[PDB]
Design a protein around this nucleic acid. Structure first.
Ligand SMILES: [Zn+2]
Ligand SMILES: [Zn+2]
Length: 52
DNA sequence: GCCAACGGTGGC
DNA sequence: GCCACCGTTGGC
């Protein structure tokens, strides 16, 4: 839907730890106010372009 | 019951 | 129209 499942980003298992989206995650100390996938995991086909 | 992460939105 | 945010919920 937002995932082609076939691109580099869909195949990643590891959050980068460093992008705006990662720094938001509780697992990285963030306040969980934004709540999107790591930038490197945003499907290059299907994702909002501004998430890429 | 928690959580990843989506879709909708209010304010700009 | 954008985007920061947050309500929602499938999957666990
Ligand atoms: Zn990241
Ligand atoms: Zn993809």
């Amino acid at each position: 839907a937002r995932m082609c499942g076939e691109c580099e980003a869909c195949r990643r298992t590891e959050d980068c730890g460093h992008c705006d989206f990662c720094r938001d995650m509780k697992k990285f100390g963030g306040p969980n106010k934004i709540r999107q996938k790591c930038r490197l995991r945003q499907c290059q086909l299907r994702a909002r372009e501004s998430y890429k």
